[PDB]
Design a protein around this motif. Structure first.
Motif, PDB file in Angstrom:
ATOM      1  N   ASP C 116      44.389 -28.713 -21.398  1.00  0.00           N
ATOM      2  CA  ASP C 116      43.033 -28.236 -21.609  1.00  0.00           C
ATOM      3  C   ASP C 116      42.040 -29.239 -21.037  1.00  0.00           C
ATOM      4  OD1 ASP C 116      43.723 -30.116 -23.548  1.00  0.00           O
ATOM      5  OD2 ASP C 116      42.210 -29.378 -24.957  1.00  0.00           O
ATOM      6  N   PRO C 118      38.343 -30.988 -21.184  1.00  0.00           N
ATOM      7  CA  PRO C 118      37.345 -31.213 -22.242  1.00  0.00           C
ATOM      8  C   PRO C 118      35.937 -30.814 -21.845  1.00  0.00           C
ATOM      9  CG  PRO C 118      37.871 -33.274 -21.182  1.00  0.00           C
ATOM     10  CD  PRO C 118      38.777 -32.245 -20.555  1.00  0.00           C
ATOM     11  N   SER C 120      33.227 -32.927 -21.091  1.00  0.00           N
ATOM     12  CA  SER C 120      32.378 -33.757 -21.933  1.00  0.00           C
ATOM     13  C   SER C 120      30.967 -33.913 -21.377  1.00  0.00           C
ATOM     14  CB  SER C 120      33.013 -35.134 -22.137  1.00  0.00           C
ATOM     15  OG  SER C 120      32.197 -35.942 -22.965  1.00  0.00           O
ATOM     16  N   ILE C 121      30.584 -33.088 -20.400  1.00  0.00           N
ATOM     17  CA  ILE C 121      29.200 -33.082 -19.931  1.00  0.00           C
ATOM     18  C   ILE C 121      28.264 -32.838 -21.106  1.00  0.00           C
ATOM     19  CG2 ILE C 121      27.548 -31.927 -18.429  1.00  0.00           C
ATOM     20  CD1 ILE C 121      31.391 -32.065 -17.856  1.00  0.00           C
ATOM     21  N   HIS C 123      30.364 -31.709 -24.029  1.00  0.00           N
ATOM     22  CA  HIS C 123      31.451 -31.901 -24.986  1.00  0.00           C
ATOM     23  C   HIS C 123      31.356 -30.903 -26.137  1.00  0.00           C
ATOM     24  CE1 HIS C 123      34.106 -34.969 -27.397  1.00  0.00           C
ATOM     25  NE2 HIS C 123      34.690 -33.799 -27.212  1.00  0.00           N
ATOM     26  N   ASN C 140      37.678 -26.072  -9.837  1.00  0.00           N
ATOM     27  CA  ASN C 140      36.363 -26.384 -10.378  1.00  0.00           C
ATOM     28  C   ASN C 140      35.765 -25.122 -10.976  1.00  0.00           C
ATOM     29  OD1 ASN C 140      34.206 -28.107 -10.992  1.00  0.00           O
ATOM     30  ND2 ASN C 140      33.087 -27.498  -9.145  1.00  0.00           N
ATOM     31  N   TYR C 166      18.928 -26.584 -18.029  1.00  0.00           N
ATOM     32  CA  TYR C 166      19.986 -27.533 -17.705  1.00  0.00           C
ATOM     33  C   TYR C 166      21.015 -27.648 -18.821  1.00  0.00           C
ATOM     34  CZ  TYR C 166      22.271 -32.050 -17.007  1.00  0.00           C
ATOM     35  OH  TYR C 166      23.197 -33.058 -16.882  1.00  0.00           O
ATOM     36  N   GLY C 167      20.582 -27.553 -20.075  1.00  0.00           N
ATOM     37  CA  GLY C 167      21.470 -27.803 -21.196  1.00  0.00           C
ATOM     38  C   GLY C 167      22.588 -26.797 -21.364  1.00  0.00           C
ATOM     39  N   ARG C 169      24.471 -25.386 -18.649  1.00  0.00           N
ATOM     40  CA  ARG C 169      25.494 -25.429 -17.614  1.00  0.00           C
ATOM     41  C   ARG C 169      26.669 -26.292 -18.055  1.00  0.00           C
ATOM     42  NH1 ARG C 169      25.458 -29.685 -13.794  1.00  0.00           N
ATOM     43  NH2 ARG C 169      26.012 -28.111 -12.227  1.00  0.00           N
ATOM     44  N   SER C 171      30.613 -27.898 -16.617  1.00  0.00           N
ATOM     45  CA  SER C 171      31.460 -28.191 -15.467  1.00  0.00           C
ATOM     46  C   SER C 171      32.854 -28.562 -15.946  1.00  0.00           C
ATOM     47  CB  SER C 171      30.867 -29.322 -14.624  1.00  0.00           C
ATOM     48  OG  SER C 171      31.680 -29.594 -13.495  1.00  0.00           O
ATOM     49  N   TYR C 172      33.854 -27.808 -15.494  1.00  0.00           N
ATOM     50  CA  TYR C 172      35.259 -28.090 -15.762  1.00  0.00           C
ATOM     51  C   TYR C 172      35.935 -28.415 -14.438  1.00  0.00           C
ATOM     52  CZ  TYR C 172      33.673 -24.986 -19.511  1.00  0.00           C
ATOM     53  OH  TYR C 172      32.945 -24.372 -20.500  1.00  0.00           O
ATOM     54  N   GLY C 173      36.761 -29.456 -14.424  1.00  0.00           N
ATOM     55  CA  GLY C 173      37.414 -29.836 -13.188  1.00  0.00           C
ATOM     56  C   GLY C 173      38.826 -30.353 -13.352  1.00  0.00           C
ATOM     57  N   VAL C 174      39.680 -30.074 -12.371  1.00  0.00           N
ATOM     58  CA  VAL C 174      41.041 -30.600 -12.358  1.00  0.00           C
ATOM     59  C   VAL C 174      41.497 -30.717 -10.912  1.00  0.00           C
ATOM     60  CG1 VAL C 174      42.155 -28.356 -12.520  1.00  0.00           C
ATOM     61  CG2 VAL C 174      43.358 -30.403 -13.296  1.00  0.00           C
ATOM     62  N   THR C 175      41.998 -31.893 -10.547  1.00  0.00           N
ATOM     63  CA  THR C 175      42.429 -32.162  -9.186  1.00  0.00           C
ATOM     64  C   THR C 175      43.816 -32.785  -9.196  1.00  0.00           C
ATOM     65  OG1 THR C 175      41.887 -33.266  -7.102  1.00  0.00           O
ATOM     66  CG2 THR C 175      41.409 -34.447  -9.144  1.00  0.00           C
ATOM     67  N   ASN C 181      36.287 -34.174  -5.477  1.00  0.00           N
ATOM     68  CA  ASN C 181      35.085 -33.700  -6.149  1.00  0.00           C
ATOM     69  C   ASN C 181      34.192 -32.940  -5.174  1.00  0.00           C
ATOM     70  OD1 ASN C 181      34.153 -35.806  -4.567  1.00  0.00           O
ATOM     71  ND2 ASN C 181      33.789 -37.189  -6.298  1.00  0.00           N
TER      72      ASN C 181
ATOM     73  N   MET F   1      18.475 -34.962 -16.683  1.00  0.00           N
ATOM     74  CA  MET F   1      17.918 -35.281 -17.993  1.00  0.00           C
ATOM     75  C   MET F   1      17.509 -36.747 -18.084  1.00  0.00           C
ATOM     76  SD  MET F   1      17.552 -32.729 -20.004  1.00  0.00           S
ATOM     77  CE  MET F   1      18.109 -31.072 -20.386  1.00  0.00           C
ATOM     78  N   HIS F  89      36.868 -39.564 -14.073  1.00  0.00           N
ATOM     79  CA  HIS F  89      38.142 -38.863 -14.035  1.00  0.00           C
ATOM     80  C   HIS F  89      39.190 -39.641 -14.815  1.00  0.00           C
ATOM     81  CE1 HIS F  89      37.376 -36.280 -10.163  1.00  0.00           C
ATOM     82  NE2 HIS F  89      36.468 -36.092 -11.103  1.00  0.00           N
ATOM     83  N   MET F  96      44.326 -35.346 -12.384  1.00  0.00           N
ATOM     84  CA  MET F  96      43.106 -35.949 -12.900  1.00  0.00           C
ATOM     85  C   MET F  96      42.174 -34.853 -13.398  1.00  0.00           C
ATOM     86  SD  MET F  96      42.325 -39.130 -10.327  1.00  0.00           S
ATOM     87  CE  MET F  96      41.508 -38.098  -9.115  1.00  0.00           C
ATOM     88  N   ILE F  97      41.671 -35.017 -14.619  1.00  0.00           N
ATOM     89  CA  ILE F  97      40.784 -34.049 -15.251  1.00  0.00           C
ATOM     90  C   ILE F  97      39.437 -34.715 -15.484  1.00  0.00           C
ATOM     91  CG2 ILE F  97      42.509 -32.552 -16.299  1.00  0.00           C
ATOM     92  CD1 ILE F  97      42.565 -34.223 -18.700  1.00  0.00           C
ATOM     93  N   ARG F  98      38.369 -34.052 -15.048  1.00  0.00           N
ATOM     94  CA  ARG F  98      37.020 -34.598 -15.154  1.00  0.00           C
ATOM     95  C   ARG F  98      36.606 -34.618 -16.619  1.00  0.00           C
ATOM     96  NH1 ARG F  98      32.345 -32.327 -11.357  1.00  0.00           N
ATOM     97  NH2 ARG F  98      33.871 -30.623 -11.403  1.00  0.00           N
ATOM     98  N   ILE F  99      36.392 -35.816 -17.161  1.00  0.00           N
ATOM     99  CA  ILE F  99      36.085 -35.988 -18.574  1.00  0.00           C
ATOM    100  C   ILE F  99      34.652 -36.417 -18.816  1.00  0.00           C
ATOM    101  CG2 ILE F  99      38.490 -36.648 -18.880  1.00  0.00           C
ATOM    102  CD1 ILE F  99      37.611 -39.451 -19.481  1.00  0.00           C
ATOM    103  N   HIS F 100      33.834 -36.540 -17.772  1.00  0.00           N
ATOM    104  CA  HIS F 100      32.433 -36.869 -17.988  1.00  0.00           C
ATOM    105  C   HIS F 100      31.662 -36.766 -16.681  1.00  0.00           C
ATOM    106  CE1 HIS F 100      29.257 -38.592 -20.573  1.00  0.00           C
ATOM    107  NE2 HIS F 100      28.795 -39.081 -19.437  1.00  0.00           N
ATOM    108  N   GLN F 101      30.386 -36.402 -16.798  1.00  0.00           N
ATOM    109  CA  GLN F 101      29.498 -36.225 -15.658  1.00  0.00           C
ATOM    110  C   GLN F 101      28.065 -36.382 -16.139  1.00  0.00           C
ATOM    111  OE1 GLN F 101      29.895 -32.482 -13.661  1.00  0.00           O
ATOM    112  NE2 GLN F 101      28.061 -32.769 -12.403  1.00  0.00           N
TER     113      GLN F 101
END
Ligand SMILES: CC(=O)N[C@@H]1[C@@H](O)[C@H](O)[C@@H](CO)O[C@H]1O
Ligand SMILES: CC(=O)N[C@@H]1[C@@H](O)[C@H](O)[C@@H](CO)O[C@H]1O
Ligand SMILES: CC(=O)N[C@@H]1[C@@H](O)[C@H](O)[C@@H](CO)O[C@H]1O
Ligand SMILES: CC(=O)N[C@@H]1[C@@H](O)[C@H](O)[C@@H](CO)O[C@H]1O
Ligand SMILES: CC(=O)N[C@@H]1[C@@H](O)[C@H](O)[C@@H](CO)O[C@H]1O
Ligand SMILES: CC(=O)N[C@@H]1[C@@H](O)[C@H](O)[C@@H](CO)O[C@H]1O
Ligand SMILES: *[C@@H]1O[C@H](CO)[C@@H](O)[C@H](O)[C@H]1NC(C)=O
Ligand SMILES: *[C@@H]1O[C@H](CO)[C@@H](O)[C@H](O)[C@H]1NC(C)=O
Ligand SMILES: *[C@@H]1O[C@H](CO)[C@@H](O)[C@H](O)[C@H]1NC(C)=O
Ligand SMILES: *[C@@H]1O[C@H](CO)[C@@H](O)[C@H](O)[C@H]1NC(C)=O
Ligand SMILES: *[C@@H]1O[C@H](CO)[C@@H](O)[C@H](O)[C@H]1NC(C)=O
Ligand SMILES: *[C@@H]1O[C@H](CO)[C@@H](O)[C@H](O)[C@H]1NC(C)=O
Ligand SMILES: *[C@@H]1O[C@H](CO)[C@@H](O)[C@H](O)[C@H]1NC(C)=O
Ligand SMILES: *[C@@H]1O[C@H](CO)[C@@H](O)[C@H](O)[C@H]1NC(C)=O
Lengths: 110, 196, 196, 196, 110, 110, 196, 110, 196, 196, 110, 110
Positions: C116, C118, C120-121, C123, C140, C166-167, C169, C171-175, C181, F1, F89, F96-101
């Motif tokens: 899964d 997370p 956390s942008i 979270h 993505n 903005y609040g 949106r 973003s989920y990512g896995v590479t 990116n 922000m 990441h 690799m999973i993006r855990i913060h931005q």
């Protein structure tokens, strides 16, 4: 899989290393060596050499050996580089079935 | 990697070719003459294609491939070349092959040849050839060809791939006439209309 | 506000996008390749779209939205961008998402990823990605995008809306490759044919 | 005089108009968007027409009229005007009216208004309005209009009549915003495609 | 239904005779008078006059009365002939519902 | 922000305030900062800095801090205004999973 | 002479005309508006034709004729003229007639007239007229007309005959307005499209 | 069926021989005599003559008789030859129904 | 020689003609007005053809011929000529003939004639004529004509033969008016459309 | 060699010809007149073809051939030439033949000839001819022709072969008139349309 | 079937040999002789000669005999050669039925 | 199957070797010899020679023999080379059926 290099106007040798697991004899097999243009180089029919289809430029320069199973080509030339094939056929009463084939590419001094 | 898609039609292709030298007369390609059927449900790939004057039935045992498409063409001296495109290759094990060629026009008959071809190029695979009739003089089969399978490269939408490793190519041959090696070459007046 | 219309087709749209970087080859859009199916009867919005070489199955839990339409396109370096337009947004709760990507052509296989993401942008949302096959390199997912969803703004009759806060949106990512990116950007040779 | 014809289609028309001011966006007429159904078997005339984003259901009690046809148009500031043509008037008794407007697109919801409108222009008739959804800002209803109903006067074959007696006209109105009287006027860019 | 005639550059009166069967109060009602071009003339919001949308030419010339429910327009003109409407709205917490309307056509000396 | 303003040719700081709820370490994380054109600025691979893809103009001007998790960019310019991203990441054995931005827009004296 | 052919369609025609003066408005001919049905099985000829706004039902008792065809036209001042062509005449006996006119559009109603017309031109035949509705002002009926029935003389293939003996013509008339004799004349802008 | 001949500029008589089997009275009947152009010549409404629609050229020259039921036309002309009709209507409360009609063609000296 | 082919349609024809002089009016040929039926199962040839205004039913007893085709035409003075083409002649025996003419339009009636015609030209054959109606003035019948049957000689594919032996021709005649011999002649404005 | 293909249609042909001299008249070829049917299930090859005026039914006993196709043509003096193409020859045994010609138009009748023809050209085969009717004057049959069978050499796709060994040809003949040998020759105005 | 030859400007006789198997009489029969152009030559109606339609050139030159049933034509001409028909009709109350016909072709000296 | 060669302007003989297994007689058989153009050479009808269809050029030069069944042609020419057929027909009461045929090709000096 077999790359052969020869010095300028050096002697050329084409072996193809027939395993011969069945311990067969030359009296029941035929052998052909042909170039990339489909022109024949030599033929050993059931143990005796034949020169029925060799192109004129390939006449005489060939020589076949019994134990080594290697063809010795002489008078190499700049334009004679190419791929040669060792096709071995079994002459059964019904038909001929290919039982071995080996590629060999040769190039000369440049 | 484990599973083949098992779809309706495929854009991704592969290669494996053969040539049959028949004695009766064929002039040129007919553009729609062939008709092919394919099967995999047995765990063994099978393709049966009826063409100009003969039906060809090919079976690959323990394959992980299903024949996607095929093409047929007629060249000089009455030679019929059939290209076969399968889904994709997952392993290198040198699958065996069973080929049966039946004369359905102008030379029908019973069985005339039921031997097997050793293919000692690597001496790992064996092809069992069965011929019904007398409408055959040469039979060549190149598995994993390294030549230019893409004809009119390329068809409108399909993608084509081909093996580039010399160690996987296999050559099976059977001739009844005198010294008919290299029964014919690809790039010729061969039109190669799609087989279906 | 409480009820979604539950109609046949909608003139009003929304936004949510994703991009899949696959290893095998895709040349360009085919204009009719995709086929989509939509469902809401479960109180969870589900959209399953089969496209160029894979099937994407996305589910939003506790949504109050039903996926009205979708569009798919192919860009540089074999990337597949899918935009999804839903009916309309009624509340801000940061729904969860479950995405399953199945390779149906040229790289089939079994499950290779079940973790899964997370995100956390903010979270608050978690996306569960299940990938069957080996035909994926980047994944993505942008929920509530702020970029220009309108492609050829705008389609003949449909109306399109997009979040400007903005609040919302996510973003989920896995590479699986190295530092992929921003797998691609919207405004390109991307044709973006309608998905149905 | 006693009986209405009860035919399939009528060459003879009449008048009764209304306008709905909705908040979501409508650009222009679509020429074939509306779809209407009519009924009289109950002794009460009823017409239910589904258009751009709302369904309007109108009923006249003790009418002696059956809604022959209708037309819908869109003007400035997202106003939807509906004209209704009935068979013919036999008596002057100021029939009551019941109107229900349901938002079927982009603002669905439950009941938000169930009151009745007095219409004290003569203070003899009462119209009961029920609104489901939030897609309404103005509601005006003019019974027995005196303005020029004939649009593109006149349609190919139909004949159109209109009341010329001031005493029979009635005006019902309900507004939620600030002073939206005269929500719009007939002769404008209003296209007025036939409603069916 | 109400025709009003006045002498040249006379004073104009627009009543609309609100029956007021419910015995309501001005604190919960709004009144508008508008001409044939949709330009407002005066507004009485819940008991107090408002001048938020009146056109400049209509400013000042209007006067409102409590008991008579009549608007007194002064400085008539040749081009001021037309139709005026007495629209009364009831400001409920939910929405405003029209509860009375009255037309009046006025013309001046020709 | 997060809006950052700096005086003309001042020093620039880009923080992104990784909460780190799981209490992870820099040995299992990577961090990237990129501008609106997708050009990289810095990379901290598993705790060691890397300079394998930074553009020449971006070389040297960047500096990374441990406790503050803020990148310090020096020698600001008129054309350096834009948006920067803090992509973190987590390098698992599978992927690799993006855990913060975090977005941050910076502008200079006008 | 004894029998009528009792065929499908006839080339040979005859004549008998009538005119109805209605109050509501009809502009001009529509070229295909009428629809007629015929019957003889009862030994009494009957023709029921539905036209612009009224249905006309004519019955000849002891006829030996079956109505072959009919035509309808609209003239000035809202007059509807109907010509009726029967098979052929075998005897001269001054058949009776029963005519019923029903208003099916814009003035429907119950029975308003049930008297009989003497026709004292020769005073041998009586026509019973029944009117439902109020859409009638004049009613004239000329049996065995002596005028020029052939309109656009003549239709492509049909043959037309007409009585030339003054003693057989009959005139029935009923008017509700003031002095409406000769409600209209034949040769005018009357288009006279075939009735079927 | 009635042919009447008159000498050049003679007198003309139009009878139509109403049988009157019902023994009706002139008080409940109307009578019209009209030419081939539909122009009226005379009218006896319920026993009283009327001159409401007669064309000017026909004014005065007509005379009606009670017992004979014949109309006398004077001042004949070369162009007055034509057909005249005797239309009798019964004025019932519901409507008027035609109860007699008779044609007569007249010509003058040629 | 013994058997007639008993086929569907024939290319080989023969001859036998007749002419009917009717009183009502026929203008010209209609090119498709006739409709014919043929029968032989009884050992007696029978042809029943319905044409412009009458139905003709002809029967040859002990014939060995089946009526292959027919043609009908209209000439001057309202004459109707019918040519009948049979398969072929096997023997010379002067067959008998029965002809029934029924007026199916504009002159229907019961039987008005039931006598027989001697035809003493050779005095070996007899024709029985039954006429229903009053729509007949002349009736002439030429069996085995010697004139020029080929009209527009010749039809696209058919072959035509005609008797040339004077001893086989037969003439049957019946007239009700005065001296109507030679009711009409072949080569005229007669169109002679094929009868079917 | 043992089996014939037993297919739907054959691209490979052969030869065997015959000519019928009939007395009645045939003008020219019709291009679609013939209709032929074929059968082999009995081990005897049978072809029944109905043409211009006669039906020909031919049977080969112990044949190993099935009549693939046929062609028909008409020449001078009313001659009907029929060519028949069979699959292929496997052995030289001089098969027997049975031919029956039935007159189905213009000369029908019963059996008139039931004898057999010796064909002593080599005197090894016998053909039995049965003729029904009188529509025949010459009958010639050439088995294994040596002349130029290819008409318009050659048809679009078919391949044609012909015997070139003199010892296999056979000639059967029967004439009723005087000295009708060589009833006609191939290369003439004979159109030779395909027979089916 | 009856060929008659006459010398140049000879007399012509046309018989048709009515067998009269029924032994009928001339009172119930009519006889007509006509040429190839359909022009009549003579008519014997129920025993009396009639000259109602004979062409002027044919008038007078014809003569009918009772017992011989032969018509005698005089003044032959070069252009009078042709075919003549003997049509006999029986005058029943219902209609006339042709009971005999006989053709004869005549030619003159050429 | 029979090739006959003759010297320049030599004599020609055409036999066809009729086996005559049935021991039939010439009285019931007809014999024809024809060239490649279908022109007849001679005919023996039931034992008697006939000259009803022979072309003029072939008249007289032919002679028929009984025992040998051979036709003797004289006065050979350069253009007379070609094929000749020995067609034998059996004249049964119903029809004639061919019972024997033989081809023979002759060429002369060139
Ligand atoms: C007779 C023969 O060919 N046997 C071989 C078999 O030993 C081998 O396991 C199989 C797999 O390639 O192929 C086949
Ligand atoms: C494992 C996980 O993601 N759990 C969350 C859950 O705590 C939350 O209540 C729900 C609603 O957004 O979304 C999901
Ligand atoms: C609540 C209401 O509106 N009631 C009236 C009712 O009193 C009247 O009889 C009827 C006829 O129009 O209309 C409604
Ligand atoms: C009331 C009336 O009109 N009766 C007559 C009747 O006497 C007559 O027999 C019939 C035939 O014309 O017509 C009607
Ligand atoms: C009344 C009559 O006509 N009878 C004859 C009959 O005697 C004859 O046998 C038959 C054959 O032609 O024809 C008929
Ligand atoms: C009467 C006759 O013709 N008999 C022969 C027969 O002896 C022969 O076996 C057969 C095979 O061709 O052909 C046939
Ligand atoms: C093809 O060959 C397989 C075995 O090699 C056989 O089972 C199958 O029946 C064949 N197909 C056909 C159509 O005969
Ligand atoms: C796809 O692209 C490759 C190379 O980019 C090309 O060789 C091939 O022909 C293309 N095929 C199609 C269907 O576009
Ligand atoms: C509707 O109008 C908006 C702006 O008024 C425009 O952006 C959009 O493209 C329009 N769409 C249609 C279908 O008319
Ligand atoms: C009918 O006529 C009226 C006026 O005569 C006109 O206004 C109307 O448009 C016309 N309609 C048709 C269908 O002709
Ligand atoms: C027409 O009138 C007759 C009686 O005049 C009636 O019986 C019949 O029902 C009427 N036709 C229709 C369709 O009502
Ligand atoms: C038939 O002929 C008559 C006069 O000969 C003519 O008046 C009529 O129009 C014609 N009708 C047709 C259909 O030919
Ligand atoms: C057939 O030929 C004859 C004469 O040879 C000719 O009169 C006839 O019209 C032709 N018919 C057809 C259908 O060819
Ligand atoms: C096939 O080729 C041969 C010779 O090559 C030719 O005679 C024949 O007409 C050709 N047929 C077709 C169908 O191409």
């Amino acid at each position: 899989m077999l790359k052969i290099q020869a010095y300028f106007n050096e002697t050329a040798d084409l072996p193809c290393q027939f395993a011969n697991s069945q311990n067969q004899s030359l009296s029941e097999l035929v052998v052909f060596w042909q170039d990339q243009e489909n022109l024949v180089l030599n033929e050993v029919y059931l143990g005796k050499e034949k020169f029925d289809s060799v192109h004129s430029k390939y006449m005489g320069r060939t020589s076949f050996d019994s134990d080594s199973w290697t063809l010795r080509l002489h008078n190499l030339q700049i334009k004679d580089k190419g791929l040669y094939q060792c096709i071995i056929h079994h002459k059964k009463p019904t038909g001929m079935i290919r039982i071995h084939q080996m590629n060999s590419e040769l190039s000369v001094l440049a | 990697t484990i599973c083949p898609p098992r779809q309706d039609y495929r854009y991704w292709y592969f290669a494996a070719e053969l040539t049959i030298g028949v004695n009766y007369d064929i002039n040129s390609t007919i553009m729609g003459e062939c008709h092919m059927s394919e099967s995999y449900i047995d765990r063994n790939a099978n393709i049966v294609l009826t063409g100009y004057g003969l039906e060809i039935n090919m079976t690959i045992m323990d394959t992980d491939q299903r024949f996607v498409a095929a093409a047929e063409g007629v060249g000089k001296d009455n030679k019929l070349s059939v290209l076969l495109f399968t889904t994709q290759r997952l392993d290198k094990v040198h699958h065996n092959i069973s080929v049966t060629i039946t004369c359905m026009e102008m030379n029908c008959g019973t069985t005339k040849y039921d031997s097997d071809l050793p293919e000692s190029i690597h001496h790992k695979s064996s092809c069992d050839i069965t011929i019904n009739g007398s409408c055959v003089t040469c039979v060549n089969l190149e598995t994993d060809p390294t030549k230019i399978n893409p004809h009119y490269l390329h068809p409108k939408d399909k993608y084509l791939y081909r093996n580039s490793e010399y160690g996987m190519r296999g050559s099976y041959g059977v001739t009844f006439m005198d010294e008919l090696n290299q029964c014919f070459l690809d790039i010729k007046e061969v039109s190669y209309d799609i087989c279906y």
